[PDB]
């Protein structure tokens, strides 16, 4: 037959790939960076505390001005905050209370959100009659929407539990591009700083780099033992970090096409929920299930500081674009700003 | 520029007072998640609740018993994996687990799903209301005597109907032993884990039953009572 011969040639390719991967592993990142000086103890403190949410927070995203931010709670709300003064700028009620993600358009004109309704809803904050209302609403997914991020005010990429990601044209409401190939539920995506590529971490313990304009998967990275829960890009664009349920963070490089470094401790046995780099990429912040956030030195794999301020699982995080502060959302219905 | 500070302050005030009314409404709605295998009846119970009492097959139903509001939701439009969207329901008041008690071979699937829900790290405190549905079909199969329980659960051969059993008037002891055996297989799991943070309340429903509401009301009340007890260590 032919299915078993394609399965065999598949395994042959997988071993040629493993050999081509061990071929470029001439050194390790730790040996190269062993002579650098450590970042030192990093003790950030809560500068603001943002209250108001009636349920567990699931997503947050700073704006480009690094001042406003949106947070999504399971009371059916999406609150926009002026993080400097802790005032609430908007409180958007949702037709479905099971929201799971939220993004902030780089123009500050739109917020997005979606969840178990399998629908991505875009809301125009700069409406002309007075009050924020629904502007677009994207249907087509057969699974729950786990993450979404704007490219511009008219293009938006979504990740869903039907094991697919999709690039949408908000006006026509059509999926202008579909990304398939993941086996498990896609949990997180992160767009490259130039909108040109984006990576995705799925529940099949794999991350995939996708070409936005062509709809093809360029590179697939593995190494995690369990579900990948969070992902982000290195500020340079040629590296990215992943966090998974096996209580480990891993730094992969795009051009070398294999894992570079692993961040773990034998006293942390909980599933990583969120990851994000600092402005310079020297610090990697990760949110754990044990209610804490660990700040790792992205070059030496040593753990440097902790942000112990939540009383329940930290569900999300994000660093400002100016690097001035990091926010952490948890299932206690509170957001906390750190710097 | 102080004017913009006052405009932000009064936008925050209108927001906070809308959020206060929303807090009272959300605080007074009792969310109930309906879970269970298919061919069991989740949708039929939501529909029959929407027929008699009222509400908004659709994921949700909203009904009131004695001035107490409930919102019951069954998720229909997902895949078959549930290890990640299940955590969207860690704060529900109770999970209504529906099990086709008359389907002798998909019963192991229901037991395994109940075990995975009961020992979930994020659902450790969510109590489950067990609906052993389709009792009329179970009586049909037991009286027919064509498919016997011993072929799927050999323990059933040595099982004795409990001395605390309350059969309805006119029930064959074989039917009592079959439905109380399914009852005890799920109670053996719920008490095998325990820890007193949550409990399982079995109820032998048929979906078209009029009282399903009352049973949920009575049990949500018991769950809150026991939560308040275990809070003051009185339990």
């Amino acid at each position, epitope marked *: 037959s032919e299915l078993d011969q394609l399965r065999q040639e598949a395994e042959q390719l997988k071993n040629q790939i493993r050999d081509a991967r061990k071929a470029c592993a001439d050194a390790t990142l730790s040996q190269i960076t062993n002579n650098i000086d450590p970042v030192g103890r990093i003790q950030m403190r809560t500068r603001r505390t943002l209250r108001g949410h009636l349920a567990k927070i699931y997503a947050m995203h700073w704006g480009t001005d690094s001042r406003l931010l949106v947070s999504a709670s399971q009371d059916g709300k999406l609150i926009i905050w002026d993080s400097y003064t802790t005032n609430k700028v908007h409180a958007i009620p949702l037709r479905s209370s099971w929201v799971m993600t939220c993004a902030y358009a780089p123009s500050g004109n739109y917020v997005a959100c979606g969840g178990l309704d399998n629908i991505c809803s875009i809301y125009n904050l700069k409406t002309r009659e007075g009050n924020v209302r629904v502007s677009r609403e994207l249907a087509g997914h057969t699974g729950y929407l786990s993450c979404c991020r704007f490219l511009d005010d008219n293009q938006i990429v979504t990740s869903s539990g039907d094991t697919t990601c999709a690039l949408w044209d908000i006006e026509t409401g059509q999926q202008t591009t579909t990304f398939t190939g993941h086996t498990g539920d896609v949990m997180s995506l992160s767009l490259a700083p130039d909108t040109r590529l984006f990576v995705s971490g799925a529940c099949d*313990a794999s991350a995939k780099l996708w070409d936005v304009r062509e709809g093809m998967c360029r590179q697939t990275f593995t190494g995690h033992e369990s579900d990948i829960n969070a992902i982000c890009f290195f500020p340079n664009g040629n590296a990215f970090a992943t966090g998974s349920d096996d209580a480990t963070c891993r730094l992969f490089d795009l051009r070398a096409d294999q894992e570079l470094m692993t961040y773990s401790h034998d006293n942390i046995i909980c599933g990583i929920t969120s990851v994000s780099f600092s402005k310079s990429g020297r610090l990697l912040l990760a949110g754990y299930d044990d209610f804490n956030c660990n700040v790792w030195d992205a070059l030496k794999a040593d753990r440097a500081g902790v942000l112990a301020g939540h009383d329940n699982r930290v569900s999300c995080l994000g660093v400002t674009d100016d690097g001035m502060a990091v926010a952490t959302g948890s299932w206690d219905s509170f957001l906390k700003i750190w710097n | 520029q102080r004017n913009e500070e006052k405009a932000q302050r009064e936008a925050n005030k209108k927001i906070e007072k809308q959020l206060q009314k929303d807090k009272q409404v959300y605080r007074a709605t009792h969310r109930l998640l309906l879970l269970g295998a298919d061919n069991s009846g989740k949708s039929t119970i939501v529909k029959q609740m929407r027929i008699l009492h009222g509400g908004s097959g659709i994921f949700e139903t909203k009904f009131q018993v004695d001035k107490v509001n409930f919102h019951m939701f069954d998720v229909g439009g997902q895949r078959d*994996e549930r290890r990640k969207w299940i955590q969207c329901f860690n704060d529900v008041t109770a999970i209504i687990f529906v099990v086709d008690s008359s389907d002798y071979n998909r019963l192991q699937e229901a037991l*395994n799903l109940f075990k*995975s829900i009961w020992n979930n790290r994020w659902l450790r405190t969510i109590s489950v209301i067990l609906f052993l549905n389709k009792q009329d079909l179970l009586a049909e199969k037991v009286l027919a005597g064509k498919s016997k329980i011993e072929d799927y659960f050999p323990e059933f051969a040595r099982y004795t109907t409990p001395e605390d059993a309350t059969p309805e008037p006119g029930e064959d002891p074989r039917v009592t032993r079959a439905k109380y055996f399914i009852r005890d297989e799920f109670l053996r799991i719920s008490t095998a884990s325990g820890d007193g943070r949550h409990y399982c309340y079995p109820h032998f429903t048929c979906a078209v039953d009029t009282e399903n509401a009352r049973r949920i009301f009575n049990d949500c009340r018991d769950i809150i009572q026991r939560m308040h007890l275990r809070q003051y260590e009185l339990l």
Partner: nanobody, 128 residues
Framework: QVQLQESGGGLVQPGGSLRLSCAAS????????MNWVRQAPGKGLEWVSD????????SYTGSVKGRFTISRDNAKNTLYLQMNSLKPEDTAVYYC?????????????????????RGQGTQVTVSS
């Protein structure tokens, strides 16, 4: 990359015997609860037996209770389902599934079509 390879299992007359060896590569074997999920021809996935993180607590589906055993060896990084007294209905593919999270007791791995942490299967056939 997590990958699970099962082996053993062929045409065996009723009342015979077999031993299915599932070798795991790509993770830490000790942390994960392991299961044996079988699929008979023409029916959905069925769950056969599970063994805990260290062989402490074992459990079986009713139909295979008292016939099969399941042993875990973390040293050689494998687990074995020793089947004896096979019936004409034990003919099925036998995937060796791993629960998707370490250090826990729950899993959801009998999924209808696609689960990412189970092997490929060894079609065990039993007929006269």
């Amino acid at each position: 990359q997590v990958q699970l390879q099962e082996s053993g299992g062929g045409l065996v007359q009723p009342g015979g015997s077999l031993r299915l060896s599932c070798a795991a590569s790509g993770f830490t074997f000790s942390n994960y609860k392991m299961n044996w999920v079988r699929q008979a021809p023409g029916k959905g996935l069925e769950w056969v037996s599970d063994i805990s993180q260290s062989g402490a607590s074992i459990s079986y589906t009713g139909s295979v209770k008292g016939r099969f055993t399941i042993s875990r060896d973390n040293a050689k990084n494998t687990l074995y389902l020793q089947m004896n007294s096979l019936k004409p209905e034990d003919t099925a593919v036998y995937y060796c599934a791993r629960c998707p999270a370490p250090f826990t007791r729950d899993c959801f791995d009998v999924t209808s079509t696609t689960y990412a942490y189970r092997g490929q299967g060894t079609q065990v056939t039993v007929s006269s």
